[PDB]
Amino acid sequence: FNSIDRVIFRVPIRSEYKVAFPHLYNSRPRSVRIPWYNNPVSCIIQNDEPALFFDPSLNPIPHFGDFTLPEDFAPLLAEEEELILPNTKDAMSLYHSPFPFNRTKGKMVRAQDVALAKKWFLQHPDEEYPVKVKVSYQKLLKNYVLNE
Amino acid sequence: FTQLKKNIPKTRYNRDYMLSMANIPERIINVGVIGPLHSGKTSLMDLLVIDSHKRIPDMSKNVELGWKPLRYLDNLKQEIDRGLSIKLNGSTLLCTDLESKSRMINFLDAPGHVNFMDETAVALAASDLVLIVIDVVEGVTFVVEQLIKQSIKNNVAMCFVINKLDRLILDLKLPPMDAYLKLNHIIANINSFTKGNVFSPIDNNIIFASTKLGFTFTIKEFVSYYYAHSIPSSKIDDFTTRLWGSVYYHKGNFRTKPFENVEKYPTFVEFILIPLYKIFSYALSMEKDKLKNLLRSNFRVNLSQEALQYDPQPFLKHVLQLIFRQQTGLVDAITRCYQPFELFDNKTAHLSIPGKSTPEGTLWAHVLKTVDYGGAEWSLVRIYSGLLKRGDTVRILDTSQSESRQKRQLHDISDETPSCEVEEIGLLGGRYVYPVHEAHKGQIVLIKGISSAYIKSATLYSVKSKEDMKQLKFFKPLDYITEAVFKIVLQPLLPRELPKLLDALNKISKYYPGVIIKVEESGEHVILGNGELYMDCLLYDLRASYAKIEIKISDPLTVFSESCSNESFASIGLSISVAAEPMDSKMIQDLSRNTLGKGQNCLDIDGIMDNPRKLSKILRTEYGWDSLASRNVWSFYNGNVLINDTLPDEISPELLSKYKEQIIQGFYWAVKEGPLAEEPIYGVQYKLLSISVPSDVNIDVMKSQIIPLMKKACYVGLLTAIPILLEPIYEVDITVHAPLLPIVEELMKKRRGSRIYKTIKVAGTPLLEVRGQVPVIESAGFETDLRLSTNGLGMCQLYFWHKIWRKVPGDVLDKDAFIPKLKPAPINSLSRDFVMKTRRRKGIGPTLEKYISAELYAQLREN
Ligand SMILES: Nc1nc2c(ncn2[C@@H]2O[C@H](COP(=O)(O)OP(=O)(O)OP(=O)(O)O)[C@@H](O)[C@H]2O)c(=O)[nH]1
Ligand SMILES: [Mg+2]
């Protein structure tokens, strides 16, 4: 057997490393599920103050007639003036919601529909989206100091 | 006969038409889709696969509505559970540009994870043009930075698709003006790495996309759909070129600076972005009655009645797919941005040797990769000459022997030993393989009969004439971008079933090209991969498929490199004397980059001995070598040089010439297996001081003694110095939200020898991008630490394509090193611990005593 005289010990293999890399980290049992590796770091801004706006949380972006066309030429949707309808913010928040609340059989989103949804996952802080944004920072910044 | 072909989905176009394209070599384009992890390339091929096929069996679930992607190219069970491309897949499709000319274009979908870099290296070796898919949010990160450089490094054309545009509108909720600024900064960074070539939307170089919502477009495509029929046919070309940059439009005019009293919106945001932003906004937020009219009035888009019932996200992917239609702007960018004349001749020279085109009768092909489909082994092969007929017995030569066979070919200018029969020829379809009778020049296909005469890659050809056989060239073995540094040793649980493990290990050596698997002469078998994911994936394949046995493996380990940190003493039948000193720091890097010198005054390492005049010039001018040493260089090997520092009136240079080849061969054996723990030597400058020339013997036996003695001679030179142990260093690319940087730093301190280097703010996003390096031995579970510590708001990947070797802390000859038996060794003992433990696996501390006679060893101890 590979004795203690052969093995190089440098870091302890935490229990979470076995649910992440089963076959590599000596999980052994054949009947262990190989899991979803990860998902791209999501940055969904539900800025909460009306048009779209640059959120102050975001880093800045570095920077900032010889030929003519008909005078009536216009972009594709210049006829419609407003980029943002009154219920766009709610529809976008509803778009990022989970399986139950994100679906409508084609009907228009209403400010009441998101209000009940927002109250719902606020009352269940175990899943969904209440941990996201500032809540996660408060939880994660403290929970690391408490563990170590 | 149809056989099992009855199940493959039919293509809207007749496949026989597509096959007819291959008759004209100028009508085939080999495109490989590459990019960082989870950028969109697997979901991008979905579009093309869907647009090319009439109906997909076993579908009709949430994929039809777009709730979950149809991972058509990621079919392996491990690929489905993990959610990422693992092995290179592809699809041969007939595509048409905006000028109605059609091509057969061979797509290869490469994995984005850093661990599978060996796969994209196969794609780069196969592709003529590469589609680099990048996530808008992360932008031009290190992984795409090295992909740009690596594409330019090879000879592949490039067009950029900048994916996940939905993130800006919905996730970041950026306004169109600020959104365009982000898109411009991304393109800005692209050009900083593309050297002379300028990439821009108006040059059909850059494609926009949101593969999740089913659309990829280009400015040319956009104007062709909804603006071309509103302006004079002559003005269309001038109009597109004004849709990017500081160009503003008002009531029919174009001026560089903004109009004083109108909204100061450039053309791109006014004619493209704000249309996009408000077909996003209106689809999610506007009444279906008013919306259906706008789509009909502005886009000539009719909304079916069932569509008005769709859930929002399926509705969004539906309307967008109605507008942007079959990615044709993408295929235009590919066909326009190629120009084969310059590249193909250059690409073939780099993948092999420079020379004259092969005779049109002789068959010549690049078998790139071994992959198993339906259990049986296949071979990804791209044809360069001749015509591949089914059943044509063909001669296969493993790319390892290519170096030996090419010089032996030139020797024969001053019968082939391996051959076999090709049984089947197939095209890639992602989820299927389409059987084909013949492969034409420029096709990349699947081959079945040839996978038993090579391990990792080979060179296919047919003899044809006797005199054409003096002309052909052999493909150089591929340059997998990263070196294998993750070391795992394993043994079967029951020793009787070890042959079953041996046969399965051979299959992984074929299936995983990045892996390096060897058995040490002492006993157990080692697996060399690049990262945790690479190892965990091959083990499952080894455990749950190819062997199906209980296996026992070790903790994560590494391959070390041993070198010196001082010049050493001279020191010394016959005997020879060499001294070793550390190589120049700048020179070590350059050789790690396979180039010697800098500033357009450099020589590629492959022909470094072949060009003696420039070698001497560059060595003296660029590195500062004195006159005599520059000419006297003999060999280069894995970051080490063997120079000739003997005096001409001690051994005649005539006598030294005949023995010089054996002296090199001994220098080679020493660098392969160093003294302390038999690890490869790195970054050492071996000066050959003097040798003995005893006469009165036969040269053939004398030549046999110099090699082993020169091997042993090099060992004392490194041991007489200050011999050190060098360990590889993983580099780490962390993308993490900005206020979450503290947990990154603390986790970084807990890992030894791990520090943060450059820290770049990602523009327009809250997340920061931090580049760092971590020792490979201390890298175990670091990615999994960071993800859970950050709840997913942090993420990192570890690569080793730069070849960083640091000194393992502490002295390594120090016998009195406290090494705990149950807890990790203290810092000052790491060198001694690592070398002794590595030695125990190899067998049998390390000292100079064994190599020097006891009397001479005593005389040196007193002096
Ligand atoms: N917002 C958005 N998300 C996308 C888009 N395309 C893909 N995704 C998401 O990102 C994940 C990546 O999908 P893939 O196409 O398999 O990415 P990939 O580059 O092939 O993955 P690797 O090859 O392992 O790097 C998917 O599961 C989607 O959920 C896109 O266009 N927009
Ligand atoms: Mg994938």
Numbering used by the authors:
A (entry chain B): 367 to 415, 420 to 434, 450 to 533
B (entry chain A): 106 to 519, 532 to 689, 705 to 976, 986 to 1004
What does the paper say about this structure?
The spliceosomal assembly, activation, catalysis and disassembly cycle is driven and controlled by eight highly conserved superfamily 2 RNA-dependent NTPases/RNA helicases and a single G protein, Snu114 (7,8). Snu114 bears striking resemblance to the prokaryotic/eukaryotic ribosomal translocases EF-G/eEF2, exhibiting the same five-domain arrangement preceded by a Snu114-specific, ca. 125 residue, acidic N-terminal region. A prime candidate for such functions is the Prp8 protein, which forms a salt-stable complex with Snu114 (15), extensively interacts with Snu114 G and G’ domains in structures of spliceosomal complexes and is generally considered a master regulator of the spliceosome. Still, this activity could be reliably quantified and we unequivocally showed that it is completely abrogated in the presence of Prp8SBR. The latter observation formally establishes Prp8 as a GTPase-inhibiting protein, and thus to the best of our knowledge as the first GTPase-regulatory factor, of Snu114.
Based on these observations, we prepared a recombinant Snu11472-1008–Prp8SBR complex by co-production of Snu11472-1008 and Prp8SBR in insect cells, and determined its crystal structure at 3.1 Å resolution. Crystals contained two independent copies of the Snu11472-1008–Prp8SBR complex, which were virtually identical (root-mean-square deviation [rmsd] of 0.66 Å for 997 pairs of Cα atoms). Snu11472-1008 contains five EF-G/eEF2-like domains, i.e. G, G’, II, III, IV and V, with the G’ domain inserted into the G domain, and domain V intervening between the IVa and IVb sub-domains. It adopts a compact conformation, in which the N-terminal G and G’ domains form a globular head that is cradled in an array of domains II, III and V, and in which the split domain IV forms a pedestal at the bottom. Prp8SBR exhibits an extended, loosely twisted conformation that lacks a globular fold, suggesting that the fragment would be intrinsically disordered in isolation. Residues 402–410 stretches along the open side of the nucleotide-binding pocket and the following residues 411–471 form a long loop, previously referred to as the Prp8 lasso, which encircles a protruding region of the G’ domain. In the crystal structure of the isolated Snu11472-1008–Prp8SBR complex, the electron density clearly indicated that both Snu114 molecules in an asymmetric unit were bound to GTP and a metal ion, most likely Mg2+, although no nucleotide had been added during purification or crystallization. Similar to the situation in structures of spliceosomal complexes, H218 in the isolated Snu11472-1008–Prp8SBR complex is rotated away from the GTP γ-phosphate, hydrogen bonding with the hydroxyl group of Prp8SBR Y403. W402 of Prp8SBR lies on top of the Snu11472-1008 switch I region, helping to anchor the neighboring Prp8SBR Y403 in front of the nucleotide-binding pocket.
